[model samples]
Target: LGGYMLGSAMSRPIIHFGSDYEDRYYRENMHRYPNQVYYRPMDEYSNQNNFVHDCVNITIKQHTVTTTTKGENFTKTDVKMMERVVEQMCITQYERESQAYYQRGSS
Candidate 1:
């Protein structure tokens, strides 16, 4: 079937907000075309001058999990974990803006 181009540059900038942020965006505005997400300011934390990454870090850390019964319960971040914490957070204005880099489909 015919479809949008998938192998080259997408031309437009794509937001990469993970499921969490995506939900927020959609919840705020229901539309076929997505716009850059604009996060609500954290006035309480604003005093600390919390940049997007800092707040994103707070959101992610608070987004952890648990283990099996009789098993230890803890958080899970892929080692290097640091890798997941960047530039992507830079995609949106933060004060303004998931999980896709590029597509792979049949030609």
Candidate 2:
């Protein structure tokens, strides 16, 4: 609703983040209001990075089967399959990070 405002010449920079980031910001800044601000660094493969691309590829490989009902909702099996796939992907990424950390420590 606040999209129709334009300053004459100079204005402050507007930044936007996802709802998850917003929640994190609010939780971390509950102590100070209108005084201090915290900026969270974006991870390499976070939502701001290649999340949509990864999800698209994952969905392409692991298709989401929809039932032929009125609303054409996803079946339980499909939901579980997607959930399991995402869980495995997250675990695999964590494992990779751990391996990299160990290698750097050894070297």
Candidate 3:
């Protein structure tokens, strides 16, 4: 029955890059956590010259979803969805770093 707590004056940011279902899922579960979430749009940094460098300043919240229902562990569908989200995040992070590399190469 223990809950989690983020540090005082802490910043937990998330860059959402998912379909409508993912967005809906995120919104529905947003209130389940004790920490406050800050969602920043990926497009907001697309045009910024130093966006890649600034990414280090952002903090990603640890996602934890648990069910107390007996005989009910994470379903295959749930695992698949979570995997997809993680894949998307990894791809996005890679792309951002690749872009930064390309920019430096050109300059």
Candidate 4:
């Protein structure tokens, strides 16, 4: 409210999120799991690997989000961010679990 000139940066696109996605606990070096060591036939050891599988799967589930939103499609980047965060949850569990997605919270 200090300078009074509010219109200077007016033409920028309206996307609000920055590179960090404004989520706290954002610096964790992905997630890791002990079960991966114990489990057999592990095709993927990290959520990053799951991204391929996960993205394909989310393309299905994200449809659910659209349905809930009355068929509103999210921007591609927005969808990818959500997909990325869900992968982090997989790392947190170290299980690559994907029945549910964990959208992280922020300050």
Instruction: Name the top lDDT candidate.
Output: 3
lDDT of each: 0.30, 0.33, 0.37, 0.33
| lDDT of model 4 at position 8 | 17
Cα lDDT tens digits for candidate 2, 1-107:
02211112121112224466654543453232111111122245334224333433343233332212323334554343334333334333444445555566633
The better-scoring model by lDDT among 1 and 4 is 4
lDDT (tens digit, per residue) of candidate 4 on 1-107: 12111111111112223655533222332221111111111233434465444443443254445433774444554444445544433333333233233332221
Q: Which runs in model 3 stand beyond 4 Å of their true positions?
A: 1-27, 30-75
Task: Name the regions of candidate 1 deviating beyond 4 angstroms.
Answer: 1-49, 66-79, 82-87, 90-107
Clashing pairs in 2: none
Clashing pairs in 4: none
Q: Which stretches of candidate 2 lie over 4 Å from their true place?
A: 1-77
- TM-score order of candidates, top first: 3, 4, 1, 2
Each candidate structure's TM-score, on Cα atoms with residue i matched to residue i, is 0.27, 0.26, 0.31, 0.30
Residue 99, candidate 2: how far off, in angstroms?
A: 1.2
Clashes of 3: 0
Model 3 gets an lDDT of 0.37
Q: What is the clash count for each candidate, in the order shown? A: 6, 0, 0, 0
Best by TM-score: 3
* Superposition TM-score, candidate 1 onto the true structure: 0.27
